[PDB]
Amino acid sequence: MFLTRSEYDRGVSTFSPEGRLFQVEYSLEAIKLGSTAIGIATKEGVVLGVEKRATSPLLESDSIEKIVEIDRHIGCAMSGLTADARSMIEHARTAAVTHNLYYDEDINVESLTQSVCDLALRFGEGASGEERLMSRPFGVALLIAGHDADDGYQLFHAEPSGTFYRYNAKAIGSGSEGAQAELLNEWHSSLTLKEAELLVLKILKQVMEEKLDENNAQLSCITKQDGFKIYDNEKTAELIKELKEKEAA
Amino acid sequence: QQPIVTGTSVISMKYDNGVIIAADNLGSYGSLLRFNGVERLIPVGDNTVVGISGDISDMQHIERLLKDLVTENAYDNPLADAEEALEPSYIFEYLATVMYQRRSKMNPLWNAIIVAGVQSNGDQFLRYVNLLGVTYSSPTLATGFGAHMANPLLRKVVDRESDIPKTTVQVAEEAIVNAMRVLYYRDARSSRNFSLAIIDKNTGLTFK
Amino acid sequence: FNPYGDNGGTILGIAGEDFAVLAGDTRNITDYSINSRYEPKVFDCGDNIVMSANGFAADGDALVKRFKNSVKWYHFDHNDKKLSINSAARNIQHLLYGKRF
Amino acid sequence: MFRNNYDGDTVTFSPTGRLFQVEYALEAIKQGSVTVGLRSNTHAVLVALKRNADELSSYQKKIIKCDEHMGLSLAGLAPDARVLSNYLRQQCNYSSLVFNRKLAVERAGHLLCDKAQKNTQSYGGRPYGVGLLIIGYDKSGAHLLEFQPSGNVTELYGTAIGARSQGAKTYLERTLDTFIKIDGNPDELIKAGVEAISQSLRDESLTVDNLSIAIVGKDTPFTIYDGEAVAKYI
Amino acid sequence: SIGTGYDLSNSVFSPDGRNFQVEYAVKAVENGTTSIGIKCNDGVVFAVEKLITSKLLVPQKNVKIQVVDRHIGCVYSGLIPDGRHLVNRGREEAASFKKLYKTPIPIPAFADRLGQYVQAHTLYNSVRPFGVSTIFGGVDKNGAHLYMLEPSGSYWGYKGAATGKGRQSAKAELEKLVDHHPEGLSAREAVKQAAKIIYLAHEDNKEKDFELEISWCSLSETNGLHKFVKGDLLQEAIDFAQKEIN
Amino acid sequence: MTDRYSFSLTTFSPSGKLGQIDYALTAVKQGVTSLGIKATNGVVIATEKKSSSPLAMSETLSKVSLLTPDIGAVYSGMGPDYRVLVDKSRKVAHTSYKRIYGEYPPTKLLVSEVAKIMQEATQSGGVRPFGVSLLIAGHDEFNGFSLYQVDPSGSYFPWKATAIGKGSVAAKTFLEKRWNDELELEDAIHIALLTLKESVEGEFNGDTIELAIIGDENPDLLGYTGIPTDKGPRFRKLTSQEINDRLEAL
Amino acid sequence: SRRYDSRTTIFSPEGRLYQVEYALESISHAGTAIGIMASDGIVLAAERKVTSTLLEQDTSTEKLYKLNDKIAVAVAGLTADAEILINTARIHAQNYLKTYNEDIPVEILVRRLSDIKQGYTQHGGLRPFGVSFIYAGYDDRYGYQLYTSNPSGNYTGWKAISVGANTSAAQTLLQMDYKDDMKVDDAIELALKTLSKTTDSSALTYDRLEFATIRKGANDGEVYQKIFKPQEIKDILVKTGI
Amino acid sequence: SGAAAASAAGYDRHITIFSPEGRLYQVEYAFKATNQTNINSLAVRGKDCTVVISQKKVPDKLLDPTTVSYIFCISRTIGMVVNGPIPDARNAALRAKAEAAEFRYKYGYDMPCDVLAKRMANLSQIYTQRAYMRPLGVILTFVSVDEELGPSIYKTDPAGYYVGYKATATGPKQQEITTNLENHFKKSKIDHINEESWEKVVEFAITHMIDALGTEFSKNDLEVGVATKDKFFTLSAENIEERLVAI
Amino acid sequence: SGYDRALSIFSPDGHIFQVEYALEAVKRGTCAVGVKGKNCVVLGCERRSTLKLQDTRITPSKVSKIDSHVVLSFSGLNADSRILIEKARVEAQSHRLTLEDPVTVEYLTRYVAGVQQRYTQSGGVRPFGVSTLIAGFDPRDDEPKLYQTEPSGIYSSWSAQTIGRNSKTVREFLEKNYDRKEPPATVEECVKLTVRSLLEVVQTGAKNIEITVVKPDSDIVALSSEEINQYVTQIEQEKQE
């Protein structure tokens, strides 16, 4: 039988005889579009990093916010369908704040990641017998870089399908497959913070169409002491020229 | 609410091999004494009883569902004659949390519920709850004037936790039956009648 | 009609410097009537916490039973996290403030 | 080798009575991992196996607790196991509030044979493409089960789910005389499951990270063993 | 497959006044085990082939009878859960016949609160019918009763019933008895006389071993309630049966 | 060949036309003949009874039916979509108008309260319309006598002398060959049965026909003699014998 | 192509909703309706398709209508869906007066009543109205007015329009002889000429038509919804020498 | 050509779709269900006593024939007999039996068969407007002995048509029967039938559904009803043994 | 194909289509433009006047004002335009009620957007064939601001934009003539940058233009047709060449 994918494709709630339903597997293909992202974790500091897809020379590129704050000790990224993000994160923070009421403490990081993943699952029944709120499972594949006392510095990969993972060095989006092999072979368990910011500003170079500058990229780094901050342009340009001064020698 | 057909007191006590509880058989309308054929004791299984006071309109409402509770236990558990049956703690919490969720709704049941029986291991059980849902336990209990008159008495037989296995059945039945005498001697609404229930962790149960 | 009355009790509990305790009576009374002689009032609520409800009895137990049940949902969700006291400072602010009227 | 209709909703029948989207659900297990369970007169256990994405990536939850006299081990579509656990976490908690009793395990599967049938009748919804086991020691002895999306449950002395399994069940068809008499000695029962699962592999070698165990007993609560606390059995 | 258009849905009518989705459910009962119920001079006895797929299954505790409130029983042959969905409506309404009328529900008035429910599924469109055909009877004030339920919504009063794949067989051995014994069997030979049948009805499936189950309700031996069996009663009935056919 | 803009209603076709209404108006033209024409001092409403079998009492069901004393009706087409209509038409006099104005309504405001009972069922799928038609006919005291048609679309063309059903144009061809401006009722009544002798087959007697009138008050039908102003009904169904003489006068 | 015609929320790749445009040919079946804006009083007009002899075409105005003593309408489209949104308009104007105690302006309800016809070209399995209008009003802010509302929800203010059938010429004939002063009685003698010269028949009777007039023309200023009866169009009709 | 463009171009699976012939077909396909039993009832009037008869087949021996019946005592003074499958007869029977009641709770007397055929038929229309429910594949008869009208028969079909016959039959075999009493009435010109006793009128109606039916009948293959003032009920088996002795 | 009907369902690529098909409907509609300097923000829109009977005092003006300190333009189809404004200005006015500080513009555009990202969630509802441009300052601040909405439910900040018909000509015209790090610094210059941005595509008409500007102190103004003819014609001198 050859008409297994041709007909069982479009309705969400149709098992195909191979066991699988497709309209979720296509949602996974969405975030393969968009602009890439990286997350590296450390005993000393978590770090992210993105491109920006310079589209026109007159836009004000502080606006498209592939990276956000979500709480004082958590921060996100996303390499997917845009508008379906701002329906996500205005829930995800809302738990962390709500949690600061019902329990008066900086929430853990995974529980937040479990509240999201119990939201995209609303093309169906959620955990507590809920019914439905949508029919368009959406591509906003996240990276939740955070800190909490039990287990230190973490990141995750939260996908629409619900299931997630505690990756240590991830890279999602269009430049993944060329990267996630490159980060496969250059992740010790004993790196620094700044032995990573330069790294993630080397893979990003080779993988992206244009050349690398401050304008077409940025990054962030939380810390248990300072918090989520999105670095500055002239600060980033410090690291870029620093790299070249390391390459030639 | 405010009741009309209100019952009267009951009595309990624990002992070495089991417990004893009993009531009288009476239905009031005020000072009048209309009905005297009723009971106050609704057995459940072969280990457990429940005494009732208060509004007899509601005592009919308790017995209607306890018989159904055990019934809906038997559904799909062939094992549930021997060990997966209704011991009392499987019950009393149903007659407790019903009530707190029936008080806060503000249409309560003006009964005063006593429960007696034995677990499967063999140990004593006894507990109590009024309409407001409060709960407690001790080796001997009563209701209404029975607790203002006869509870002090029976505690002379059973002071506290120590002297429980310093006791037997023949001495036990021969105390409350003398407390029965008091209420028929002085209590306003009592009646000469009686209705007894004993339990034994070995011989089981019997009745009036 | 009156939905709640009185049952008695009188409690107290102290912190040291590297310890603490909690004390509570062990009698229940209706209206100068010994309703019972020994019925406890104070419970290890898991994660080495002790609490007590002195006053009306039923409410003083149903409140607890929601706290013994909140504490475990805190473990099932958040992966066996030990629940500090600061949490229960304002968690219990909510269980009660859900009944202000 | 041609199109068929009647295979587009759980509402409709075949021209013979085969509901299809259930016959396609429980094929889904065959591309989820393995996990097995065992019984005795005094102890239950189950063994699992993990799968990852890349060696950086963390491994995937395969046992989850529900209450201290129960558990489960899934094999299939996880989002439709996150649910069912959070359905019987409630029921097992419902009872303790209202009856102060321990729940009978065989009136938990009966509560899952229902919920997996409501979705099966009516338009909307899916058949929960999962297959999961149950364990526990209530008063009626040890227990084990084996759930399917159709609704049908069974109890038995220990089984396996998932792809590359039948090498196990052929083992457990042998030793049924043995691993049920095994009483008061957990640490050799558990060494059967780990032995069983190794029959049904394709050059994996059974690392510590790949594996996860649960156990109960006479007085032993539902406690799981993953990671460096598991290398005993290798 | 007379109509390729009039089968994709329910709530339709063919040109021949038919709806075929019911006529396909019935072919899901046929792919199910055998189950029977005999009527007797005092009560009834039920039975079933309980197949076993492996050696690993625990005996006598993957039961298949479902006991309604103490005086009527129900046995299935087909898709089990749609069944167990159905008693779990019959086990609740009968209460709602009790708390208004205080009598245990009779048997007929228990049927029309099923046989009228099932018929509801076979007239809407957003649902599926039931793939069962459950037998049920018991005892009441006015004697015994026994019925068949069938996914078309029909039910009729039977002295003997049999479904599953052993239909054409057990519809013979239940014709013989009702010629020998018009006077009403007693409730201590029908039982062993049931075991004779399921061991005869197995022979469509001589491949695989199995297990036998019985449940029985009559006034004399039980005082008017529903109950399983145990002990010498069924063991002899086993010993009775496989004897006679060897 | 089909059209793929006709299996449903909310779909426009390139000629800016809708699907099922055009066929409902054919469901009536296949139906029996019924009519009603007009006069100076009254209105007549007629049709026949094509009794299916001989054993069906053709009296236990009335094509014609009263809505108010001054207003009566008749259909042509489907039946069950008539007695389900009127039972929710006459009410609306007693619900929307009467109780907040004291008195029964005019003849056209009744129609507006029918035709939206007719148009509620042509705006959402999951509803076949009413495959019928109507000829409402009545009277009131500022605009006078009247006649009105009501199609399933919700439109209500008025008229003077008209018929509907299969035998329509043969009749409408005949009316103006016989219709006038100053005609009187008992002159306008034998017309409206010799109109019906052509569109018929077989028997033509009181037990295969029934019709109505409108006129001056019929207080003998009223019942409560003693009031000066409550002049009673204005609508009366002519019995068999009251018809069955006129034919022999013809 | 894969045919995008079946719901009014489908958006063909070129960006165009087909099932709205269809309505805008469901209007050509209608009966013409004209209104010219004078300097001292608007005129409206109309024409009917079905004019058989034995039906009372004397009192029954089917197209021309009122909304209050200031505003009038002339419809062109389906008739089942005119009562629905001309009672609503009446019910809107009063429920403005009732709670601001001054009269309704035109630009409000035309703005409103057209958004209603947009609330159906967007959501649900609903249909868009097959309707158009020719409003005719007065108000302090601008005085005399003319307006128009498609079956989409889009409206525009004008000086002289025909809707319905054969507007192509009836605009063309109109726009090349409409002076800009056009005293009211000189407007009527234009509107008939358009209908006289655009129609299909040759009779252009008194029964087929109705044309009304708004008039401020009285002393002690106020408005007058003058509708004309059959007896005086005849005076209009003989006077021209048809 | 008749249903060729029907069976191909839809029009046979939605209820609420007309054909360009005007015909909707689903309800016109319901009637094929009425004959799915090969069963054939009857009804006739009296001076004050009404009767209805039905076969009661001889299937496999295992049935309990006390319960197989298509005669349902609805209320007092009322009764009904169906033509169609059993399950689609109950839901009509029960929607009625809880409808005569509330009337008597809300209007102070018992409904006639007039209204009871106008009410239940005012519903089967509705279910051919909406998609609530497939129209019940039946055609059902009512009976009564009213105070103001005397005996009365009525009839109802899945569209909503209802007329009160004088006498009628139904099933696969109407033409044979119906002629064997249509010709009978033109003899005497009596809408009713003579033989005052509800007894003697049965034996009239039996024998006409023997000669024109096609075979001979025992006591078991039949089940019969009757309506008399204050009552409605069913019957015994001797009424035929006291026929053939006379002949 | 099959995947190009609805909103609920995806391609086997990831693309969701209907949203992409709305933006084709934008481009069947008249232009618009928005420029900002430092003391000024502006807006333009090429109208039509192609009919003579139509009265011109109520000319179809793309512009709408949400509050005193905010303006708007649009594109696409106008049956929907009246809606978003009629919910937008409601929301600005139900903000200062609830807060007594008017809208940060970034609060507004997240409600014009928000009403588009609800009408792209569920079948049974249609998107908006529309695409806006916002222009207005905050209260008590000078920073000139400008966003655009889009039926996908997204929005971005822009120093200069042109949408509607033939925008793919006007953008690159503005990629030269602008420079982010030296904006125009006078309310004349943005207009001249803005007018000659229309003159590529507008058949050298001058009756076919509308300009409306905005400044602090709750300032807005529409300009005069005779104030354009001298902002028009003086350019033509400057291409005497």
From Swiss-Prot, chain B:
Main localization of the protein? cytoplasm
UniProt-annotated location(s): Cytoplasm; Nucleus
GO terms for biological process? proteasomal ubiquitin-independent protein catabolic process; proteasome assembly; proteasome-mediated ubiquitin-dependent protein catabolic process
Keyword Glycoprotein, does the record have it? no
Which ranges does the record mark as transmembrane? none
Q: Which UniProt keywords apply?
A: Cytoplasm, Nucleus, Proteasome
Q: Which GO terms describe its cellular component?
A: cytosol; nucleus; proteasome complex; proteasome core complex, beta-subunit complex; proteasome storage granule
Coiled coil start-end:
none
Instruction: Describe, as the record does, how this protein assembles with itself and its partners.
Output: The 26S proteasome consists of a 20S proteasome core and two 19S regulatory subunits. The 20S proteasome core is composed of 28 subunits that are arranged in four stacked rings, resulting in a barrel-shaped structure. The two end rings are each formed by seven alpha subunits, and the two central rings are each formed by seven beta subunits. The catalytic chamber with the active sites is on the inside of the barrel. Interacts with CIC1.
Q: What does the similarity note say?
A: Belongs to the peptidase T1B family.
Miscellaneous notes for this chain?
A: Present with 16900 molecules/cell in log phase SD medium.
UniProt protein name: Proteasome subunit beta type-7
Organism for this UniProt entry: Saccharomyces cerevisiae (strain ATCC 204508 / S288c) (Baker's yeast)
Query: The organism's lineage?
Result: Eukaryota, Fungi, Dikarya, Ascomycota, Saccharomycotina
Curated annotation (Swiss-Prot), chain C:
Disulfide bonds, paired cysteine numbers: none
Q: Which residues cross the membrane?
A: none
Q: Where in the cell is it found?
A: Cytoplasm; Nucleus
The function of this protein is: Non-catalytic component of the proteasome which degrades poly-ubiquitinated proteins in the cytoplasm and in the nucleus. It is essential for the regulated turnover of proteins and for the removal of misfolded proteins. The proteasome is a multicatalytic proteinase complex that is characterized by its ability to cleave peptides with Arg, Phe, Tyr, Leu, and Glu adjacent to the leaving group at neutral or slightly basic pH. It has an ATP-dependent proteolytic activity.
Q: Can you state the subunit structure given in the record?
A: The 26S proteasome consists of a 20S proteasome core and two 19S regulatory subunits. The 20S proteasome core is composed of 28 subunits that are arranged in four stacked rings, resulting in a barrel-shaped structure. The two end rings are each formed by seven alpha subunits, and the two central rings are each formed by seven beta subunits. The catalytic chamber with the active sites is on the inside of the barrel.
Q: Which family does it belong to?
A: Belongs to the peptidase T1B family.
UniProt-recorded name of the protein: Proteasome subunit beta type-6
Q: Its gene? A: PRE7
Swiss-Prot record, chain H:
Residue(s) of cross-link: Glycyl lysine isopeptide (Lys-Gly) (interchain with G-Cter in ubiquitin): K231
Phosphoserine-modified residues are S236
Instruction: Return one Gene Ontology term, BP aspect.
Output: proteasomal ubiquitin-independent protein catabolic process
Under the heading SMART domains, the entry gives: Proteasome_A_N
Task: Provide this UniProt record's keywords sorted from A to Z.
Answer: Acetylation, Cytoplasm, Isopeptide bond, Nucleus, Phosphoprotein, Proteasome, Ubl conjugation
Q: Where in the cell is it found?
A: Cytoplasm; Nucleus
* InterPro entries for the chain: Ntn_hydrolases_N, Proteasome_alpha, Proteasome_alpha-type, Proteasome_asu_N, Proteasome_sua/b, Proteasome_subunit_alpha6
GO CC annotation terms, alphabetical: mitochondrion; nucleus; proteasome complex; proteasome core complex, alpha-subunit complex
| Additional detail | Present with 15200 molecules/cell in log phase SD medium.
The record's family statement is: Belongs to the peptidase T1A family.
| Protein purpose | The proteasome degrades poly-ubiquitinated proteins in the cytoplasm and in the nucleus. It is essential for the regulated turnover of proteins and for the removal of misfolded proteins. The proteasome is a multicatalytic proteinase complex that is characterized by its ability to cleave peptides with Arg, Phe, Tyr, Leu, and Glu adjacent to the leaving group at neutral or slightly basic pH. It has an ATP-dependent proteolytic activity.
Record's PANTHER family?
PROTEASOME SUBUNIT ALPHA/BETA
What name does this protein carry?
Proteasome subunit alpha type-1
This chain's source organism reads Saccharomyces cerevisiae (strain ATCC 204508 / S288c)
UniProtKB/Swiss-Prot annotation, chain I:
- Look up the domain of life of the source: Eukaryota
- What SMART domains does the database record attribute to this sequence? Proteasome_A_N (SM00948)
Listed under GO cellular component are: mitochondrion; nuclear outer membrane-endoplasmic reticulum membrane network; nucleus; proteasome complex; proteasome core complex, alpha-subunit complex; proteasome storage granule
Annotated coiled-coil positions are: none
The cross-references to CDD domains, in alphabetical order and at most eight, read: proteasome_alpha_type_7
Q: Which residues carry this modification: Phosphothreonine?
A: T59
Q: Which Pfam families match?
A: Proteasome, Proteasome_A_N
Q: Does the keyword Repeat apply?
A: no
Output one GO BP term: proteasomal ubiquitin-independent protein catabolic process
Mind telling me which NCBIfam families this protein's record contains?
Answer: PRK03996.1 (NF003075)
Q: What does this protein do?
A: The proteasome degrades poly-ubiquitinated proteins in the cytoplasm and in the nucleus. It is essential for the regulated turnover of proteins and for the removal of misfolded proteins. The proteasome is a multicatalytic proteinase complex that is characterized by its ability to cleave peptides with Arg, Phe, Tyr, Leu, and Glu adjacent to the leaving group at neutral or slightly basic pH. It has an ATP-dependent proteolytic activity.
**Additional observations:** Present with 16800 molecules/cell in log phase SD medium.
The text of the family note is: Belongs to the peptidase T1A family.
What is the official name of this protein in its record? Proteasome subunit alpha type-4
The organism that produces this protein has a lineage beginning with: Eukaryota, Fungi, Dikarya, Ascomycota, Saccharomycotina
